[PDB]
Write a protein that binds this ligand. Structure first.
Ligand SMILES: CCCCCCCCOP(=O)(O)OC[C@H]1O[C@@H](n2cnc3c(N)ncnc32)[C@H](O)[C@@H]1O
Lengths: 337, 127
């Protein structure tokens, strides 16, 4: 009885990502762990991804679509209840991506769907107007462990997917991993009326066949804390702007705007979420306050509220331009959103 | 191929005693071959107190997000923010330009319980 089966009935990506890691870390040395879960309206990004560059954080915010940075690598993908997630965990030296890959491809076959693995991270199917990606995978390995999690596009909202993954046209220069764009489709045109609990059985069954044993599924409740050790701490971290947004690798942002009083351009060097240094170039007849802002804007948190704070705290020093700095803050707050 | 003058660990790291009493760290050839073409190296915080066996950096290769541990406890001196531009250096020059970080060995009783060069191949023909 060395296989374990975990089912999350929560759609909170922060919740679900916290759970994944915990299990993963505190996982016995000789287990093989399968984790089934999904997330409501969410954008999930890899360790070293710039959120503001890889997805439409402004749209995301306007529709409270959650952002969640994951421990694994890879690009940005979109999750609603139409998206099914699967995580395969196994200790070394037994861990092997390809084993879990086929187990999933097996489940697909059992349901009637025929897909072939593509590149190093994709699962695609054949169709009348070309090929279509129906899955995406990312992997994390330690010294003794390893887990493969990926997504299955059952009946997801592709236009919302397309929407949030299409970021604003910001002027960004950023280190980190960029997303690889494929053409996706739902497994729904291959298998009509396909549900989540249906795909769950498939992957569970194939999984059970491979390691030739079984175990009652363990259901992790959403409303209330899992007894898993070290949780609260992880969950709290997974949920933190510091991790989701903050972990952004060094990048610079160039923003600009015409104000009836003049043009303003701002350069930001950003590092661990904080502006390490800002510059202003402007044809305004009043550089005083703006040149003063760029200095004062150091160490600031790359975010609307803080940016607007440093602004109001500037009015108190340059009242003769209360009107302007009002528009400035206004424009500046949205520009980085 | 395993620079005979360097110490090694279980997690496939190599330590170089720097004249100035400091310590440079990186991943062994063998290790960077298993991982794969490096695309991003998550460097530890500059000036951070770490412990031996503690994960202090994450290597993201086309193949996976791999953990990298600090062999010896101490102060995070420097980081090779040359990798934040040419992560391939970890593949090409695992011992040269592909050095990850440096450190000060707070408690050096850890060196005592490590593996030498010849003791590395002995580990390779199994693990
Ligand atoms: C909890 C599982 C997390 C696994 C994430 C996989 C990382 C994928 O990164 P890539 O750069 O390989 O993919 C980017 C590309 O993938 C398409 N896409 C968006 N959402 C998707 C879902 N839910 N499933 C499959 N593919 C998806 C987009 O074209 C995006 O550009």
């Amino acid at each position: 009885s060395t296989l374990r089966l975990l089912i999350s009935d929560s759609y909170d990506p922060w919740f679900n990502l916290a759970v994944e890691e915990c299990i993963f870390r505190q996982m016995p040395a000789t287990q093989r762990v399968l984790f089934l879960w999904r997330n409501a309206d969410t954008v999930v990004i890899g360790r070293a991804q710039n959120p503001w560059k890889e997805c439409n954080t402004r749209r995301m915010e306007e529709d409270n679509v959650r952002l969640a940075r994951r421990s694994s690598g890879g690009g940005a993908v979109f999750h609603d209840l139409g998206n099914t997630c699967f995580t395969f965990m196994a200790g070394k030296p037994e861990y092997d991506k390809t084993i879990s890959t086929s187990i999933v491809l097996n489940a697909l076959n059992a349901l009637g769907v025929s897909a072939e693995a593509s590149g190093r991270n994709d699962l695609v199917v054949k169709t009348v107007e070309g090929d279509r990606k129906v899955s995406g995978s990312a992997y994390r390995e330690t010294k003794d462990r390893g887990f493969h999690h990926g997504t299955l596009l059952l009946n997801a909202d592709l236009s919302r997917l397309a929407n949030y993954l299409n970021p604003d046209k910001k002027k960004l220069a950023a280190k980190g991993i960029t997303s690889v764009r494929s053409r996706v489709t739902n497994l729904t045109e291959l298998l009509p009326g396909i549900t989540h609990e249906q795909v769950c059985e498939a992957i569970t069954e194939a999984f059970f066949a491979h390691y030739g044993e079984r175990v009652e599924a363990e259901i992790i409740s959403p409303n209330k804390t899992p007894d898993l050790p070290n949780f609260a701490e992880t969950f709290a971290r997974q949920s933190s702007w510091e991790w989701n947004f903050g972990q952004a690798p060094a990048f610079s942002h160039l923003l600009d705007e015409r104000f009836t009083w003049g043009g303003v351009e701002l350069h930001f060097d950003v590092e661990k979420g904080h502006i390490t240094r800002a510059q202003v170039f402007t044809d305004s007849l009043n550089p005083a306050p703006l040149e003063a802002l760029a200095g004062r804007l150091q160490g600031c948190l790359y975010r609307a509220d803080m940016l607007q704070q440093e602004c109001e705290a500037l009015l108190v020093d340059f009242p003769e331009q209360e009107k302007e700095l009002r528009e400035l803050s206004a424009w500046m707050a949205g520009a980085v959103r | 191929n395993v620079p005979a003058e360097l110490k090694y660990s279980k997690e496939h790291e190599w330590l170089r005693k720097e004249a100035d009493g400091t310590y440079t760290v990186g991943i062994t050839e063998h290790a960077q071959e298993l991982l794969g073409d490096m695309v991003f190296v998550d460097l530890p915080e500059v000036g951070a107190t770490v412990s031996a066996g503690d994960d202090c950096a994450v290597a993201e290769s086309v193949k996976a997000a791999s953990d990298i541990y600090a062999p010896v406890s101490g102060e995070i001196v420097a980081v090779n923010d040359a990798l934040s531009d040419s992560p391939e250096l970890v593949n090409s020059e695992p011992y040269a330009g592909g050095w990850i970080f440096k450190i000060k060995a707070s408690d050096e009783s850890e060196l005592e319980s490590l593996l030498d060069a010849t003791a590395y191949e002995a580990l390779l023909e199994d693990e």
